[PDB]
């Protein structure tokens, strides 16, 4: 599946 | 399996990390980077490669990255993360 | 000042931490060494030099090293350390 | 002043 990146 | 929990006080700012994952339920949600000089780096509490098992007591087991994001958007002054070492 | 909390599950084994301190109430209780291959070291979330402010929610403010020893022995399976970065 | 250690 598509791998997404999230900044937090 | 080394699992521990950390409670981070963010002093009104971000945790200073990026997490990566997919919408495939059982795919792991991992810490992919640490912001230079950010909270995560300065505390040395979490590191790249670490898997996030829960956020603020809500389990991510079998949950997509969107769930982790939903929880993070509701994070208060203190955020709790259950971590599994790789 | 940067403070964070770490919860470790020592189960029946040791945390793999050595603390140092005096019996002078105001002196800080610090993490002086880590057991190679021990739990604390494996998590990567515990660092030498940092100060322990509380153990399992009981504050070490104005308390001697002996009090910290007491709290650790009665901490149970899960040990929660409130830590202040050096 | 005496500094002591405790391993756990």
Say which DSSP state C55 is in. Answer: E
For residue B40, which of B27, B22, B52 has the smallest C-alpha distance? B52
For residue C29, which of C72, C60, C71, C70 has the smallest C-alpha distance? C60
In sequence order, what are the residues at sequence separation of 6 or more whose Cβ sits closer than 8 angstroms to the Cβ of residue B74? B56
For residue C66, which of C38, C18, C24 has the smallest C-alpha distance? C24
Tokens of B50: 């670490």
Tokens of B62: 């079998």
Is A4 close to B21, i.e. CB distance below 8 A?
Answer: yes
Instruction: Answer whether C5's CB lies under 8 Å from C76's CB.
Output: no
For chain B, give every domain's residue range.
Answer: 1-86
Is D2 close to C18, i.e. CB distance below 8 A?
Answer: no
CATH number of the structural domain B1-86:
2.30.42.10
Phi, psi of B35 (to 5 degrees): -70, 130
Nearest CA in chain B to C2: B43
CA distance C53 to C61: 7
From residue C68, alpha-carbon distances to B21, B38, C41, C51, C54 in Å are 40, 30, 20, 12, 8
């Amino acid at each position: 599946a598509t791998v997404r990146t999230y900044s937090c | 399996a080394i699992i521990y929990t950390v409670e981070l006080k963010r002093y009104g700012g971000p945790l200073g990390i990026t997490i990566s994952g997919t919408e495939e339920p059982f795919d792991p949600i991992i810490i992919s980077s640490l912001t230079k000089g950010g909270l995560a780096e300065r505390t040395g509490a979490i590191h790249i490669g670490d898997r996030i098992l829960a956020i603020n007591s809500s389990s991510l087991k079998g949950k997509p990255l969107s769930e982790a994001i939903h929880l993070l958007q509701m994070a208060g002054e203190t955020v709790t993360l259950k971590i599994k070492k790789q």
